[PDB]
Amino acid sequence: GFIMEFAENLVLRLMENPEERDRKAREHIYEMHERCKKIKEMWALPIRPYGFWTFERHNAQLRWDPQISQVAGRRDPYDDLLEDN
Amino acid sequence: ASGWGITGNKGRCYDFWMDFSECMSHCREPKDCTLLREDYLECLHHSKEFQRRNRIYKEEQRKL
């Protein structure tokens, strides 16, 4: 053929779907705003959590001392006296 | 707090500390049993008893 009859549909192939572009734009806005709200919530967390000491890793002694309160140097004076019988 | 006494028996304040720690181990707010924390602290130094005896001596002194 001639030049323009091919350059026309060439440019038309080069250009994209606008419906896809609009859908992607509204989508991206939706999830970006949702993620923005999520990050805003995340930044509100205090440095020290409400539980803190309640956490099992932050006790480390309520389940260690009971198995140590029997060794010498930690016993209540009234433990060795009546342990004989 | 540690529980190792000088004489080799036990810390005189160890039981109070363990009671306070056990209360705090299942109490997400410290205000509910701050009484045990006060008991442990003044078991270390006997502040309140000394204040009371000071008041008694002041009542003795004011009779001048």
Curated annotation (Swiss-Prot), chain B:
Subunit structure and binding partners: Complex I is composed of at least 49 different subunits. This is a component of the iron-sulfur (IP) fragment of the enzyme.
Residue span, CHCH domain: 10-51
Keyword Membrane: yes
Record localization: Mitochondrion; Mitochondrion inner membrane; Mitochondrion intermembrane space
Parts of the chain that traverse the membrane: none
CC terms in the record's Gene Ontology section: mitochondrial inner membrane; mitochondrial intermembrane space; mitochondrial membrane; mitochondrion; respiratory chain complex I
Protein task: Accessory subunit of the mitochondrial membrane respiratory chain NADH dehydrogenase (Complex I), that is believed not to be involved in catalysis. Complex I functions in the transfer of electrons from NADH to the respiratory chain. The immediate electron acceptor for the enzyme is believed to be ubiquinone.
Keywords: Disulfide bond, Electron transport, Membrane, Mitochondrion, Mitochondrion inner membrane, Respiratory chain, Transport
Protein name, as recorded: NADH dehydrogenase [ubiquinone] iron-sulfur protein 5-A
Included stretch of the parent chain: 37 to 100 of 118
Motif (Cx9C motif 1): 13-23
Motif (Cx9C motif 2): 33-43
Protein family according to the UniProt entry: Belongs to the complex I NDUFS5 subunit family.
Bilayer topology annotation: Peripheral membrane protein
Record comment regarding domains: Contains two C-X9-C motifs that are predicted to form a helix-coil-helix structure, permitting the formation of intramolecular disulfide bonds.
GO biological process: photorespiration
S-S bonds: C13-C43, C23-C33
